Design a binder for this molecule. Sequence first.
Ligand SMILES: O=C(O)C(Oc1ccc(Br)cc1)C(=O)O
Ligand SMILES: O=C(O)C(Oc1ccc(Br)cc1)C(=O)O
Ligand SMILES: O=C(O)C(Oc1ccc(Br)cc1)C(=O)O
Ligand SMILES: O=C(O)C(Oc1ccc(Br)cc1)C(=O)O
Lengths: 330, 330, 327, 330
Amino acid sequence: ALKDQLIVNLLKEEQVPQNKITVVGVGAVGMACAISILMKDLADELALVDVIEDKLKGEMMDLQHGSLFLKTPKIVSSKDYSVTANSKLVIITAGARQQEGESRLNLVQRNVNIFKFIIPNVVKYSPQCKLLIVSNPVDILTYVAWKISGFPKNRVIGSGCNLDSARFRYLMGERLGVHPLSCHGWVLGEHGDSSVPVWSGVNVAGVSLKSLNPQLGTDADKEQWKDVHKQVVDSAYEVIKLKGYTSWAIGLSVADLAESIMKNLRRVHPISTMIKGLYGIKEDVFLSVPCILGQNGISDVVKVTLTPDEEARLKKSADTLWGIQKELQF
Amino acid sequence: ALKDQLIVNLLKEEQVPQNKITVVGVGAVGMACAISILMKDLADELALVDVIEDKLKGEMMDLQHGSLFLKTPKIVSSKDYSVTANSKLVIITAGARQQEGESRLNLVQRNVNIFKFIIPNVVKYSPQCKLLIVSNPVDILTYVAWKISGFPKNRVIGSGCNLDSARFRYLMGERLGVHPLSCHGWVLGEHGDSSVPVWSGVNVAGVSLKSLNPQLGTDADKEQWKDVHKQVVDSAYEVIKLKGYTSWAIGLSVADLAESIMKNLRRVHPISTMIKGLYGIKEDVFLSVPCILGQNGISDVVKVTLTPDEEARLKKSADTLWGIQKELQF
Amino acid sequence: ALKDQLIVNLLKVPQNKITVVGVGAVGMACAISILMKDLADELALVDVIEDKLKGEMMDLQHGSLFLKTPKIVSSKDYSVTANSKLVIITAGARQQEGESRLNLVQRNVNIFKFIIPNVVKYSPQCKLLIVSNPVDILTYVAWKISGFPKNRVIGSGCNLDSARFRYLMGERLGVHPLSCHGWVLGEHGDSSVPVWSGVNVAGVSLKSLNPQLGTDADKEQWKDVHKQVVDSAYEVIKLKGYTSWAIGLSVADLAESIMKNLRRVHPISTMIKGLYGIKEDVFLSVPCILGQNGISDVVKVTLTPDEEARLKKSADTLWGIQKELQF
Amino acid sequence: ALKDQLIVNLLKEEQVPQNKITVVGVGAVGMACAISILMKDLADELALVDVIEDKLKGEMMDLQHGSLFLKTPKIVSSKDYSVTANSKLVIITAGARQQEGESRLNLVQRNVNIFKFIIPNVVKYSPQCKLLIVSNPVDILTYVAWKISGFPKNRVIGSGCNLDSARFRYLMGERLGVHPLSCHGWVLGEHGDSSVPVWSGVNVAGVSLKSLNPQLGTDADKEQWKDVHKQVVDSAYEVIKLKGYTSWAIGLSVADLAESIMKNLRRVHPISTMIKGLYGIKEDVFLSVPCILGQNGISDVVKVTLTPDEEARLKKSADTLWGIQKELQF
Ligand SMILES: O=C(O)C(Oc1ccc(Br)cc1)C(=O)O
Ligand SMILES: O=C(O)C(Oc1ccc(Br)cc1)C(=O)O
Ligand SMILES: O=C(O)C(Oc1ccc(Br)cc1)C(=O)O
Ligand SMILES: O=C(O)C(Oc1ccc(Br)cc1)C(=O)O
């Protein structure tokens, strides 16, 4: 055989990857996550899982064919979760997605059922992984993942408001004529309609925009900055109306969380976690606060000082979500 | 104004971009090209153009929402080609795409008709650009873009066999247990059914595989390496048969070429250029031969030493391409 | 020729060229970081000692397989620098153990008297990025000698200082410096001003959780962190004889914003006449928006009366030196 | 405390680094390896070791102050090898370096003594580490590291001729006006005066240059390509006499090797390994041949096809190296 004429083998390795990532779901969101993860050199193996055989294999092959341009030496796929074995990070994007007009809350039973199958299969093959939940409603499904996995809460993370805050800083950048890296602001709580823009923290170079304009984010705001937050909330509906779905921004957002997890950076991201203990929250509610994300998932939470009005929203969002998730059957 | 309280403007802005790239066509190929180029930090400005307004705007927005995770401070879109002004590189992906069972060669009339509209509009606003033709049949469409543009031939490049060769190298590495980066081999000629695998150049670490197994790639081969070329030829069709279209790998192939152009690398790539005066071809045929690629496009061509069979196969590719080029009007 | 039978040639200026003046330790650190962030299609190096220059060039060139900057050149002659987008000046006398950066001022004015016209001659449209010390005063000098508009004469300023401050903050809090925000402004030196009002994590003002933050009264002595920033160059010089890596990385970051027109904000040396009670041609670090045309805008940070005194002080000290200079 | 007010700790846990690298030696080579490794994002922890405490602490400090601009969250140092605990890769650059007119083979007795202390101490705390030897004479010292450590050969690698071939390819590129990446060719054997340029494998785009001119590399070469190899043999000495030492190129060479190991890429590199069994070599000689480098070090060796002259030169190199091995006093 040619190969053995060309190559003398020295040892038969256990081929166990050290930086394996799995993306479950090869719809648009999942493939966007896949490509962004590949072009950020985060993993040594990328596994794809979904339930339509032909599409799954088509996507696997299409990624495969770009390998010369990448630094991820093994890309694999299967309906069978054995393909996901030994992943450090499993990112779940499967499920029904919101159609035009449709609230993310309408996705909940469909996606809880899909997770009843998905989550046990992930755990069986990567008992030590971190879970990053992207499917919607992300806050409730992060909770569902947690319960079915049995994982300690540090290892079950939701993409949450990471994107909402990225979008926020982009709009702001565009208003100010400044790169969004240098524009800071946080959108926290539910990923969706009831999110809370924390106006008090919104700053460029440590200079608080609220201190310069005390009306910032109020109906009295000469410049209507509140519409920046409306734009954030409406963003995914707007994009779904225009192109049918969202992919690139969320892929990029998930990749950025993957980077923090895989490289143990300990950056701060506003992502979905279990916040019992805070802002008046007595139950097992997951929603977005600034979290320090690392190799062990969410290790620490930053306590943001909310105004009474700001804190009032949060407990609302909070109450809503508990009402829905309280009564789920799985 | 909250901006002026925050920011003292010190300089009047005549913003002209220095490294602007345009992608024409926002189908799955174009957006794969876009995302890949954004994640390789090649452009200070990215313009998108296509004819379905809503689709266009939603793609634009979706990418803009990822701006925080990117280094391309300006992303814009319009059906109007003035949005493409001052581009250093324009990448043309618009046009009809082959169905399952349909040759890329069957796309020629539809895509020539669209090229009569696209190329003059590109050239109008970006007199300095290189044109990177992706739309199919890419080799004939490179020729066509050249004829319409009035650009010199060095500035009109077809994506050509850059993908075919990545696939070949990928499949080769899989067989040998070597990264594609370290497996060498060239697929030349038409980007399509009549492509030519140059077995004589196929090597790992400078070791010719054909000299190891002389019947490499013939029907006599005990290991049927020709099936590797058959897989290269078929791959678009297999992927299309499975997922509907191809996107990620062609996108990576095009970002690779764009890297070489924008960063003046002078790397060698198998891409579409005029081969008149080689291999006994005296007509204006464009097909892939290995080309040195830089800031002024294709500046040099490597004359591959071809075995009589290989050269005959290359001439037959040229013959097939000329059979369709022969009859064109525009 | 072998070549002409291998290659048929069809066709006979760089577009993203950076020059680095000075191939001492900081200059070479600047060189390597720029080469690893793929910011340039040509890198040129200039200094006055010819073997040293040549050998740094060759050493970089030998790693070309691993880089994506296809042309690396060097020369004593400034014609090598032609068509630069950005010229980074690191040449001059360098800080010595237990000595202020202000002790280098006069000697470095004298070399810039030679360097700067030569840079301007071969790239009259470049951005100048000054790194040599004392950078604030030398950015002023570069600006007067060059005749460039002020947006194009940038001083590396307090970019490193704030990065140091952000590392140390991050060590204290157990958070990546990327998620620890805070600004050190004014003189790149002993009179720098930590702005405690802006120091935060996830938008949460550290000063609101401890109003005494950064003062004599702070139970947690956060003032020490700025003292550590002030003293770090002296420490590093004591231990290893100079500093190089951290400055290289600061300068690469600035170069990144410039070459890629990012319009990020940086605390870098710019002309401050007409802010903060300053009516002279002084340069010091304030948060500047940095892009392809250099410094286009400045953020007006809101300063507490000390912060402004302490800064108009820093401003004073420095115009105190730049006053009696002649050129 | 302000920390505790700002940040609720959710999780105690022992931080075990997953991708740690140590560099032994903080002279110019060691630090060049370090800055390159940090700038390619290969490690989640970097540890430095050397014998002079101030110098080591100052180098550590200076890197640390650039943390804002890096993605390697933990940088540490110590005279004490416990700081290197749980490394995946330990790079050894400590020892004497050659003077103008001095062979790297003159460094052997001094560097063997240093290695007697360093090696048991570096392998003590790192069960999973690979040893990448950089100090000279690298081939002999890779052998010595192998004998002292008791590691299996796949885990003990010499930087070898990775840089010689890089230099070869740069010079080649400058002759032909092609980027090094697309110029191919191997310098094998000793990293030093008895290296062997493999002209039979030297190619652009699969095109063998010897095929085009069989005088290539001989005294009858009208173009004197032998001089390119000569330039490779003398490079270090040339640079040593212009600037006092070499640093950047070797740093990049080693970071490239580190990349293949850390990212399990399985690329081929000419690096030091045991060649007992090949080219009629019957003893435990170490020298550079092309090896597949991955997460377990060298898993495979490519059997280069040598001409009788090439092979004689390799065997001659092997004799010289074996001859100094007979001098080794353990
Ligand atoms: O764009 C956004 O805001 C998000 O997009 C997606 C989120 C999850 C999936 Br699965 C698909 C798209 C969102 O819907 O939260
Ligand atoms: O995957 C491949 O081989 C190629 O992909 C595309 C090339 C151009 C466009 Br427009 C769309 C797809 C091909 O179909 O030639
Ligand atoms: O480390 C720092 O803070 C600074 O570093 C340098 C700045 C310029 C040159 Br030239 C050399 C070192 C400083 O010493 O001011
Ligand atoms: O430039 C080169 O070829 C090599 O550089 C170094 C190799 C190891 C150390 Br420790 C220091 C320099 C060489 O001298 O072998």
